[PDB]
Write a protein that binds this ligand. Structure first.
Ligand SMILES: Cc1cc2nc3c(=O)[nH]c(=O)nc-3n(C[C@H](O)[C@H](O)[C@H](O)COP(=O)(O)OP(=O)(O)OC[C@H]3O[C@@H](n4cnc5c(N)ncnc54)[C@H](O)[C@@H]3O)c2cc1C
Length: 521
């Protein structure tokens, strides 16, 4: 029942945690709510689920052998391939024996005399950890929206968050998709190709750009070490940089050519084509205009194109979706886009969806749900720190951390890749590696000095909260209805760049953890 580390989650972060911590001789017990490893890549298996960041970059760097040995089948790996990859990883490093699956951690209570966390589970587990590491992921399922008479619909209801492992045949079916976030945008084109008829029920339109040899694949494998260095020192965790000159300080021909080149290689990277693209509203207007043009050129019907165009949002404010044949899908005879602002859904009946203006005969409804950002999973845990104060309570006015890694009243607790860190703003595999490594060094630091614990300082967290506030007040990611916002106004991620952030937390470590108190037994 005693372990050095308890890890919550068995996705990318938790799997690396187990490996890294055991390599320095720590005993580890991990809990995973799911049936197998993989996290988001295990749970989220709707058709066309796919990563945003090139798989060369969105993959582990910790093992030279694994990098050379594993062959990615395409530029942006789909969910089943990333799953197979993470399964291979648990196979190679014998991680599963230290994981208990189908087990949801419910509470963690600090014993302040001992500086241990007692971790409890819905399967009746009670374990004592020196260190609690939460690797619960940054994305959790947004609530299934309550529709009147959904329980009366005779056809099939399928949720993108709980996709049938053996798939769903859409052949011969009239299909209604509700939700046009990424899970919708990625599944729609596949649904339309085999469905008899597809109705897409859209509330808000989102920004999405296209996804897009043997001799060239062996070229990056030999240059992998240099590509990782660039990534670890970059702003977003990939070997890329923005243009030198400003958006509003270049030719139109040079503008179109820079946007066109950045249109090809990725959506997250298109957002950072120009330095002031996510800072100056007028600069963003150009990227917005360039995007609208491209979509009007591909969509046949100008009325549909307009409906596909996001109302009045800065491009990049919400993360740009990566699509494969999405906008082309609306040229098909068997797909109709229904504007929910004109005709809102007022309920379901036996035979389909009823809106304000028409009834829709359907055999199948696909609920393409979204994701809550950053605090969703942590919020389902009761973490009781010093004085018996929960993390939920101390975060009531917004997340407070130092570096994302320290919180006063929570010694020996580490929340990975969450509020206070770049989090989803950076390549999350490399971010996981950075954070797990940092935690492991901190533990090694404590062990070499006979110290019982480490704890965020009230002063350092206040300074960090302010630091995150300042980097964010400038950005267009800090919009009123922003994906990235917390309790209050609080923009949750660190917005200064991955390389900058990595530099900060490493120098903090090298200085003997200034801003943390080192605690004696
Ligand atoms: C379609 C899609 C594409 C994406 N593409 C990219 C990309 O290209 N680049 C990128 O950087 N990020 C991407 N992401 C973000 C993705 O969330 C992260 O990259 C990744 O999940 C981080 O891994 P993780 O281990 O931190 O979290 P997760 O993969 O979410 O793993 C967390 C695990 O913890 C478990 N857990 C949570 N709470 C508990 C509890 N109380 N008890 C037990 N277990 C618990 C969960 O079941 C889950 O298995 C994408 C997400 C989606 C949905």
């Amino acid at each position: 029942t005693s372990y050095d580390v308890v890890v919550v989650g068995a996705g990318i972060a938790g799997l690396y945690a187990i490996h890294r911590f055991r390599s320095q001789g720590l005993t580890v017990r991990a809990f995973e709510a799911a049936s197998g490893v993989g996290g988001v890549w295990y749970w989220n298996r709707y058709p066309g689920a796919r990563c945003d960041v090139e798989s060369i970059d969105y993959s582990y760097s910790f093992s030279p052998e694994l990098e050379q040995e594993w062959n990615w089948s395409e530029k942006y790996a789909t969910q089943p391939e990333i799953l197979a990859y993470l399964e291979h990883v648990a196979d190679r490093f014998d991680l599963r024996r230290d994981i208990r699956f189908d087990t949801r951690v419910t509470s963690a209570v600090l014993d302040e005399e001992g500086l241990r966390w007692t971790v409890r589970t819905d399967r009746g587990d009670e374990v004592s950890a020196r260190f609690l590491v939460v690797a619960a992921g940054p994305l959790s399922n947004a609530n299934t929206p309550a529709f009147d008479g959904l329980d009366r619909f005779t056809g099939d209801i399928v949720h993108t968050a709980r996709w049938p492992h053996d798939g769903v045949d859409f052949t011969g079916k009239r299909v209604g998709v509700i939700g046009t976030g990424s899970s919708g945008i990625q599944s729609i084109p596949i649904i339309a190709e085999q469905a008899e008829q597809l109705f897409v029920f859209q509330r808000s339109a989102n920004y999405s750009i296209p996804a897009g040899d043997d001799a060239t694949r062996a070229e990056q494998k030999a240059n992998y070490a240099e590509r990782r260095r660039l990534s670890r020192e970059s702003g977003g965790g990939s070997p890329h940089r923005p243009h030198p000159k400003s958006a509003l300080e270049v030719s139109e021909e040079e503008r179109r050519a820079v946007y066109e080149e950045r249109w090809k290689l990725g959506g997250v990277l298109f957002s950072k084509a120009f330095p002031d693209q996510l800072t100056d509203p007028a600069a963003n207007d150009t990227a917005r205009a360039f995007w609208e043009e491209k979509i009007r050129a591909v969509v046949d019907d100008p009325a549909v194109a307009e409906l596909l165009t996001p109302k009045d949002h800065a491009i990049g404010a919400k993360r740009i979706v990566l699509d494969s044949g999405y906008y082309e899908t609306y040229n098909r005879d068997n797909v109709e886009l229904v504007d929910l602002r004109s005709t809102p859904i007022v309920g379901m009946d036996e035979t389909g969806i009823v809106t304000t203006g028409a009834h829709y005969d359907l055999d199948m409804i696909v609920l393409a749900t979204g994701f809550d950002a950053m605090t969703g999973s942590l919020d389902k845990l009761e973490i009781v720190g010093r004085g018996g104060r929960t993390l939920k309570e101390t975060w009531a006015a917004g997340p407070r951390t130092y570096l994302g890694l320290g919180i006063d009243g929570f010694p020996n607790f580490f929340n990975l890749t969450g509020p206070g860190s770049p989090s989803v703003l950076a390549n999350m595999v490399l971010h996981s590696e950075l954070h797990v490594d940092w935690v492991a060094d901190a533990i090694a630091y404590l062990d070499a000095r006979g110290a019982a614990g480490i704890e965020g300082t009230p002063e350092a967290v206040a300074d960090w909260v302010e630091e995150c506030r300042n980097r964010a007040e400038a950005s267009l990611l800090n919009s009123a209805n922003s994906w990235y916002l917390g309790a209050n106004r609080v923009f949750m991620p660190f917005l200064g760049g991955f390389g900058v952030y990595r530099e900060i937390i490493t120098e903090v470590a090298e200085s003997g953890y200034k801003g943390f108190a080192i605690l004696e037994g």
